[PDB]
Ligand binder design. Sequence first.
Ligand SMILES: Nc1ncnc2c1ncn2[C@@H]1O[C@H](COP(=O)(O)OP(=O)(O)O)[C@@H](O)[C@H]1O
Ligand SMILES: Nc1ncnc2c1ncn2[C@@H]1O[C@H](COP(=O)(O)OP(=O)(O)O)[C@@H](O)[C@H]1O
Ligand SMILES: Nc1ncnc2c1ncn2[C@@H]1O[C@H](COP(=O)(O)OP(=O)(O)O)[C@@H](O)[C@H]1O
Ligand SMILES: [Mg+2]
Ligand SMILES: [Mg+2]
Ligand SMILES: [Mg+2]
Ligand SMILES: [Mg+2]
Ligand SMILES: [Mg+2]
Lengths: 520, 525, 50, 300, 532
Amino acid sequence: VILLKEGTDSSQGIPQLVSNISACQVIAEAVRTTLGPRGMDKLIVDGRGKATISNDGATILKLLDVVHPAAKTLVDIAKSQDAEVGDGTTSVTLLAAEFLKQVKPYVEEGLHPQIIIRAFRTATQLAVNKIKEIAVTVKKADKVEQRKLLEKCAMTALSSKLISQQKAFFAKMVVDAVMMLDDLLQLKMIGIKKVQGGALEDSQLVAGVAFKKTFSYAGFEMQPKKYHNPKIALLNVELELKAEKDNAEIRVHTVEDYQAIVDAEWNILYDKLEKIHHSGAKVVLSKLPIGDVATQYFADRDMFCAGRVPEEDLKRTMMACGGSIQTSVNALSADVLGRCQVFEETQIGGERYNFFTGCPKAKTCTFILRGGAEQFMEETERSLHDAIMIVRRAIKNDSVVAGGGAIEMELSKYLRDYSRTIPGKQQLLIGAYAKALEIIPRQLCDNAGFDATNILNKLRARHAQGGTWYGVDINNEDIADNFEAFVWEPAMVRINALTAASEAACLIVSVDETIKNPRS
Amino acid sequence: YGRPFLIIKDQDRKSRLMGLEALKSHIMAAKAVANTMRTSLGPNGLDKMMVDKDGDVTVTNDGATILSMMDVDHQIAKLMVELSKSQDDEIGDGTTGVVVLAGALLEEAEQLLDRGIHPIRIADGYEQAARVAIEHLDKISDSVLVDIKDTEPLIQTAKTTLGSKVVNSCHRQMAEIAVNAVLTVADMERRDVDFELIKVEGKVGGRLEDTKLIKGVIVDKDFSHPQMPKKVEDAKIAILTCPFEPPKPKTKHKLDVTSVEDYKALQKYEKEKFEEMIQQIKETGANLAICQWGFDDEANHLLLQNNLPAVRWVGGPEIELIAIATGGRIVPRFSELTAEKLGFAGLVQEISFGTTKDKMLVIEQCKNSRAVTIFIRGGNKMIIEEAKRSLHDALCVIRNLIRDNRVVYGGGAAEISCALAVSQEADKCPTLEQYAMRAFADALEVIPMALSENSGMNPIQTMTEVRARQVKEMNPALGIDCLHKGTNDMKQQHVIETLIGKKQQISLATQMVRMILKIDDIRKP
Amino acid sequence: GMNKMVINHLEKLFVTNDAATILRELEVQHPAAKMIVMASHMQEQEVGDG
Amino acid sequence: IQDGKGDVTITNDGATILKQMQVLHPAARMLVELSKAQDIEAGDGTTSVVIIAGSLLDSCTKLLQKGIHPTIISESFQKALEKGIEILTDMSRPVELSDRETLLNSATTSLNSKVVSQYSSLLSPMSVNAVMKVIDPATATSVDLRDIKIVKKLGGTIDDCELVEGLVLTQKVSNSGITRVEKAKIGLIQFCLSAPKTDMDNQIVVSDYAQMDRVLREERAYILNLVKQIKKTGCNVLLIQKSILRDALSDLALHFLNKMKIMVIKDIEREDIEFICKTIGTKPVAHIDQFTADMLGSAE
Amino acid sequence: PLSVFGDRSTGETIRSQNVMAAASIANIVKSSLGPVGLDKMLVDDIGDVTITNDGATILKLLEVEHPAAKVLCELADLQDKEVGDGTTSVVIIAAELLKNADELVKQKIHPTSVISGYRLACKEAVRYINENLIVNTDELGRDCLINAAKTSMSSKIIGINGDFFANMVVDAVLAIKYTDIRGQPRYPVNSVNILKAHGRSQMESMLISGYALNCVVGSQGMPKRIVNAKIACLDFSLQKTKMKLGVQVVITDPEKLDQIRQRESDITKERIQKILATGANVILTTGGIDDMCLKYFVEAGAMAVRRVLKRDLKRIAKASGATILSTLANLEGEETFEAAMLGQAEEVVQERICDDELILIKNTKARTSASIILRGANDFMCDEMERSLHDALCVVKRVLESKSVVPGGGAVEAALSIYLENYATSMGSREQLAIAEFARSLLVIPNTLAVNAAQDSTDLVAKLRAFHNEAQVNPERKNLKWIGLDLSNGKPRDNKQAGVFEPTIVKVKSLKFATEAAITILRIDDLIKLHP
Ligand SMILES: Nc1ncnc2c1ncn2[C@@H]1O[C@H](COP(=O)(O)OP(=O)(O)O)[C@@H](O)[C@H]1O
Ligand SMILES: Nc1ncnc2c1ncn2[C@@H]1O[C@H](COP(=O)(O)OP(=O)(O)O)[C@@H](O)[C@H]1O
Ligand SMILES: Nc1ncnc2c1ncn2[C@@H]1O[C@H](COP(=O)(O)OP(=O)(O)O)[C@@H](O)[C@H]1O
Ligand SMILES: [Mg+2]
Ligand SMILES: [Mg+2]
Ligand SMILES: [Mg+2]
Ligand SMILES: [Mg+2]
Ligand SMILES: [Mg+2]
C-alpha cells in the first residue's frame, strides 16, 4: 500500500522552482504590451461568447483562467494592487516577473532561497524609504495648485487608455466629481450611467442626479416634464391597491360593510396620496412600485411620479437634494422634502433620463458617458474609475513623483550605488534587484517602438549625475524631464507596487515543493 | 527543463492571435462587413432579404436593422453591428454610412501599417482629421426654418431621407405625413419630440397610397355588443380604468351569508350596483364609454339599452393616447366621474378592412390633439414593415432637424468638401502624421465613389470631375448626380442631410475605428 | 524551512510550512501514517507546537 | 521548413522556401512557379520578384475597386515595365571581366543575405575563381554550372571549404594496400574484369574430371591476360565503371591488380564518365584491344 | 490568409521554443558532468538497459523529436567522432550561449549582430587558447599521458582505479605507432581490440601483447596451443568445390561420373597440403571450413579458425607480417603457396575465460601490437568500462598527435571569460554586448562543476576563480592562470600541481562546433510544421 492517495503528483527541488518562475514570466507576458501612451488593447472572449476589451493588468489577469499557483500569485498581486490604490496593476505584475527573471540565473546554481529573500526585503525597504524621501509635496494648501495637481494626476492616469485623446476633457471633469464629495470620499456617491449613441466628447457630469426612466403606467406622459423649483418627496412606500398585511382576513356578513370596506381601501389610498400632495412636494420618488391609480392621481394635479427607482439612485438623490427617505406617510414635514433648482426629463440616445440639476449643496454626482458600443463605454467607465480612484487617493496627500520610468531609474541608480558598499554576495542580488527595477522604461520604449537599449543608456548616463525626474518622452522619441513635462503620479502607487512585488517574489521563491491531490 | 508546464485551465484548445496578424484579421472582417453594406447605399441601392432562425423573411434597406439581424460570430463584426445600432439610436439616419466609413478607414489603416507605422499614430491622425472635418462641416452648413407656416424645407429633408427606400414609390405623401406627425407631437418650447405619441400602426391590404395620418387615435377593437351603432358623431367620452363589475377589496375577504335574508340582500346589492353604475355613467352625459379591463354581459345590455356605445379591453398605452387626444382624464372609479373629466371626440367610427372579420375604431378630434397616429397599408407584410421603419427614419430626421435646425447639402457634396478641407490642412502639416490625414480624406471620400458605382456611372472619373468642379468654383454643394437629372449642383435637386447626422457619423466612425486599431491580442476558445 | 504548496481535493492553494496544516490538507491513506497524523494533531491541539 | 516526413531545412532562398512549403492557392502556385523561373533565369532575386509581384497585385486591388477594367490595368502595367527597363538600363554602368574587385563585390553582395556571410571573405573569392577557371573570359556569352560539381560531406566547419582543380570521388579504394600514387596514370574501364560471358546465353558443359582443372586454369589465365594487358601500358591507377549483369571486379582479378602494385577504383556511375573525362583528360575504353597509353589520362 | 495546411510559429514564440528545447537537452546531459557527476541509466522499451556517462551515447540513445534538439544531438555525435572527449561540454556550452543570445534578442537586438559577435568571440577565444594557455608536452613525457588519461577517466566508472587503468592505456597506445609520410608518427586506435569478460574484478584486466582474437578452435581434435606459430591468414574459404553458376557438368557415359566426384573434393585437399607444405601450423580464414578440411588440419597437427572477421584478420596479418590471400594463384597459371608470406608469432593459445574461450596471439614478429580484455561484474559494467577506455584511448591519441595540453577543471574557460570581457570592452558598438555574453556563457561549465559536488559556485567564482584577474592584468602573476576548482575543498588550486590536463583539441573543437551549431539554430525566425 502506497503512502498517499493514487494520482498525487509532487514536484521538489530546483526544477520545480525554475518552472514556477517561468510560469510567472509567461503569465506576466499576457499584459506586457499594455503600458504607456502607446499601450495596446486586449480582447478576451469568454466561454459564453461575450468579449471584454481592456488594457489594465487587473481586469486582463482576472479574465484569464489561471490554474498555476505561481501565476495565481501574480493574479492576486494584480488584483490586490487594483483594490488598494486602483492604478498600477500592470506595473506590479511586470516587476514581480522581472525580479524572478533576474534572480533565476542565481537560483540555477545552489543559492539558498532565504538569502535572496532577505536581499529582496532589504532592497524593497530601502526603495520605499527613498520614494518617501524623494517625492515632493507643495505644502501650500492653496486651491488653484491643488486643482492643478489633481488635474495633472488624472490626465496622467487617462493616458494609456481608450480616452487618451480626450484626457483634458475627462480629467478635470472627474476632479469636479471629487471636489463636490464630502469628507468621506465614498465611491457610491458618484454614479456612472452608460447610454449608447453619441460621441466621446458628448459625455457630461450632472452635478445633481440623473437616472434612466424606471417605468410608467397608463397615466404617464400627462404630468409635466419640467418644474422650475420643485420639492422632491423621497419615499419607500408603494402607492397602489394591495392587501393590508399579506395575511389580513376580512370577515363581514352585510353588504353595507362590504361596500364600506371597499370604499375604505380606496379612502386609505387616497388619504396617503393626499398627505403626499399636501406636503407641498411636486415630484415624488419611491423604491417600491407606484400603481396606475397614483400615476393618474398625480397626473390630475400636475405632479410627477417615478416608482421602482434603484436604492443607490435614491440615496444619490438624497445626497444631492438634501432630503430623507420616509417609509411612513403620516409625517411629511417641510424639512424632509428635498428641493432642486431644475427637474427635467430628457431624451438621450433612445432612452428617457430624469435629471435633477442645480442643487446648491450637492454631495453627489452622476456621469452620463457616451459611446458607440457597450464595450466602448465599459472601457471608458474602467478608465474613469481608475482616474477617480487616483484622485481620491491623491486628495489625502499631494505628494507626487515624476512618471514615465523616471522613478524606476532613480531607484535603480540608488540601489546600484548602495550595492557597492555592501560586501559579499548580497551585492550581486541587490544589483539584480536594481537591474530588474530597470524594466519599466524598457517596456515603455518597446511598446512605443523605440530603440530601447539606446534610450536606456541615455537615461542611465543623463541620470547618474545629470539630474533626477528624467523619464522617456514618447512623442519626442527621446528622454525628457517628466516632472517639468507634467507627468505626475502619487508616490503611493509606486510604494505599493514595490512592496507588493517584493512580497510576491518572496512568496514564490520560498517554495521548495508542491503537491497536487486527485481533486476528488 | 524537459517537463512542459501548464498555467491556464483548458489551455490545449484555446486560440491566440497576436501582433500584426490579429490587426490584419480585424481589418479583413471590417472590410467584409463594409463590402456587404456598400451595395445598399444611395437612391440606386438595392434591398437585402434577411431571414431569421424561425424562417420568417423581411426585405429591408435600413443598415442598422440589416446588421442587427445579421447573425454573425466575429467580434469585429459584432462591434460594427453595435456601431450601426448606436448610430441609429443617436440620429436615426445614416446607419450604413458609418459602417462604410469605418470599413474605408480601416482599409486605409491597413495600407498605412503595411509601411510599419504604429496603429496609435494612425488613430491620432484619424482623430485630428475628424476634428478638421467636423469644423469644416459646421462651417459649411446652412439653416432651415422649423415652422408650420413654411414647412417646405421639412418636406425637402424628409423626401431626401425617404429616398433609397421602397416608400419612394409615393415619396411625397410619406414626407408630408412624417412632417405633420412630428410637428403636431413636438413640444416646441422644450424642443423635444416624444415618440410614444406617434402610434405607428400597420395593416395589410389596400395600397401604399392609403397610408394616412389620423389626428386622433386608431385602435384594434370593436364595439362590444354589436347591436350598438357603428359610429357616433362628436361625442363626449369617458376614459375609464375600473371594469364594469361589482367591486371587491384587494385584501382577501370572506362575506358570510348566514341567512336567506342575507342572500336576498346580496342579490339586491349586486343588481342595484349594476343599475347605479349605469345611472352614474349616464348622468355625466357621455355618449361613449371606454374601459381598459373589460366587463360582462349585464353591463353590455345596460349600456346598449341606454343608447351609450362603449368598447372594452383597451390597452394601457392606448388608454393614455385616447385620453391625451380627447383631452379627458383617466378616472379609476365611477364615483368620481364629473362633467369636466370627459373628453371630446370629433367622431368615433368603425372600419371593417374588406372581407376580413377584423375591425378597428378611429377617433378623430375637432380640437387640439397632442397625439397622432400613422396608419400604413400595403400588399405585403414585408412592405408594411419596411414602410414603418422608413417612416421611423423620416420622423427621426424631422425631430433631429427640430433640435438642431442646421443642414448640409448631401449626395456626396458634404463628404467631398470635408475631404478637400482635410487634404488642405494635411498639406501644411509636418510629416510622419500627414499620411493618416490623407488616408482619412480618401476613406471619407470613398462615399461618393460607392454612390456613383451604385448609380451605374464610372466612380473614379465622375468623382474626380465633381471634385474639380467643387475646387474651381467655390460651390461646395456639388454632388453625385445619382438620379441622372444633370445639374451636379445639389441645391436645385433639393437634397438635405442633417448636420448632426453627418457629424455624428464622422465622430462615431472615428471612435469605433480607433478602438479597433487599439486592439492587439485575441484569446478565444 | 521552505514553505510548501498543497492543492487540496477542492483545488484550494495552501502555501505554508506549518506541519499540522500541510499534514491535514494532504490526503493520507496508510494506517501507520494516519497514526502519526493523529499523534501530531493531538500535539497541536494540546500545546500548539511540536 | 519541415515537410510531412521528419526532414527539416533551414532555407533563406525564396525558391526553396516556396517549393518546400506546400501551398494550396492557385495564385500561390503561380507565384512559386514565378520564383523558380526567376531562379532558373538569373539565380538571385527569387525573393524580390515574388515580393514585387505580390505588392503590385495588392496595389492593383484598389484599382479594381476604383472601377477600372483589368485589361486597362494590364496594358498600363506593360507600358510601365517598358519604361522601367529603359530606366534600369540608363541607371547602369558597363562592367567588364578581369576586374576581380567588382566580381568579388558582386559575390559578397550575393552572399551577404545568407548564413555564410561571415565566411564570405574565405568563400566568395573561391566562388568567383570557380567560374573564372571554367570559362574563357574573352568569348563566352554563357557559362555552365553542370561542370561545377558541388560535393558536400559532413564534418568540420565552414572555414574548411576547399576548391580543387582536379577530381573528387566519394568512392572507396578496393585494395586496402595502396593509398597514395605519385605520377598517376588514370585509365577508365567500361568493360568487366571477370570471367568471360557472351551477350547471348552462356553455358559450359563438363564431362570429364580433367575438364574442371581445364576450366579453372583457363579462367585464371584469361583474367591474368586481361590484367597483364592493363599493366603493360603503364597504368598505375584503374577506374572501373559501375557495371551490372556482370561483376565489374572479380576477387581473383582484384588480387592480380593488387599483386602488380596498382590502385583500383570501382563502382563509378555512368553519368559521371563525361565529368571525369572532361576533368582528367582520359578517354574511356570498352575493349581491351584499344587500351593504350596514348589515350590514358595522367595526373600529378 | 495563407493556405499551407500546416502549423506556423513566428517571432518570439519559435525562438523561445528552440531555446527551451536546447535547454531541455542541456539539462538532461548536465547532471553527468565532472568527476562528481553520477552516470545515467537508459532502459529501452523491451528492457535492454545500459549504464552510461558520456553525452554522445546518452543523446544517441534518446529519442528526440524537436529539430532544434536534434541539432544538438548531432553536434554531440560530431564532437564524439572528431575528438572523442568533451561531448557533454560542447552541448552545455552551445545551449548556454544560445540562451544568452536569446536573452539578448528579447531586448530587440538584431540576431545578425549577436551572430557576428559570437563568431568573432570564437575566433578570439581560439586565438587566446592557442597563444596564452598551452604547455608543450615535450619536456614532460610518460607522465602527461598518464595524467591526461586519469583526468579523462575521473568522471567514468573506472576512475577509482585510474592509476591502474591509465597505465595500460598509454602502453596500448605505445604499441600502435605507425609511419605514414616517413617521418610523421600516427596512432591508429580502433586497432586495439577490446574484449568484454564478466568474471573477476576490475583490477585483473589483461593487457595482451599481440592480438586477442574473439574466436574458437574449429574442432576439438586439433591442439589448442602452438609453441612457434606459423599463421596463415586466408581470405578464402575451404569447402568442397561446387563448380560455378555458369559451369555445369553433364555426364553421358556412366563411368566418367565417379571420377569427377573425387575431384569434387580432391581440389580442396590439394590446396590444404600446399598451405601445410610450408610448415604452417595456425590457419585463420574469413570463410567457413567444412568437416573434411578440419580433419586434414587435425591429422596434420595444425589448428583452423573459421569465420574470422575482416578487420581483426587484417590487423593480425599486419602485426604478424602474414599476407592475406583472396586466392592461391601466382603470376603463372598454377596454384601455389609461398613460405615468405607466412606470419610468425611467438605463441597462439586458446585460453579459457569466465565461461567461454578466446584465442590469444602473443608476440607477433613484425611490429608490436596490443589488445585489452576488460573483466567486470556484469555485462553492463563491462560495456561501461569499454566506453570509458575508448574515451581514454582517444584522449591519449590526441595528446600524442599534438604535443600540447591545457589545464582542466574549468581553468581555461574562466581565463577565457575574464579576458574576453576586457576584450569586448573595446568595439563600442552594440556588437560588443554579444561578445561579452559569449564570455559569460563560457562560465556555464565551471559553475555546474561546483554544482555537481554539493558546493556553491557563484559564492566562490566571484573571487576564488577570479585569480585570473591578477594573472591577466599582472604579467608577473601569470602562474595563477593555471588554476581550477578542486572539489576536495572547493578551492582554486594549481592544476599543474595535480596534473589535470586535457589536449587543446577538445577545447578548440568543442568551442568552434558549439558556436557554429548555435549560429545555425539561431538564424531561425519562424517555423512551418507541415502536416503528415
Ligand atoms: N505621458 C506619459 N509619458 C510617458 N510615460 C507615461 C505617460 N503616462 C503614463 N506613463 C507610464 O505608464 C505607466 C503606467 O501605464 P498605465 O497602463 O497607464 O497604468 P498601469 O500602471 O495600470 O499599467 C507608468 O509607469 C507611467 O510611467
Ligand atoms: N437624390 C439624391 N441624390 C444624390 N444623393 C443622394 C440622394 N438621396 C440620398 N443621397 C445620398 O445617399 C446616401 C445614403 O442615403 P440612404 O441610403 O437613403 O440612407 P442612409 O444615409 O441611412 O444610408 C446619403 O449620404 C445621401 O447623401
Ligand atoms: N581531477 C580533476 N580535477 C578537477 N577537474 C576535473 C578533474 N577531472 C575532470 N575534471 C573536469 O571535469 C570535466 C569532466 O568532463 P567529462 O564529463 O569527463 O567530459 P565528457 O563530456 O567527454 O564526458 C572536465 O571538463 C574536466 O575539466
Ligand atoms: Mg493605469
Ligand atoms: Mg438615410
Ligand atoms: Mg513549528
Ligand atoms: Mg541575393
Ligand atoms: Mg570526459
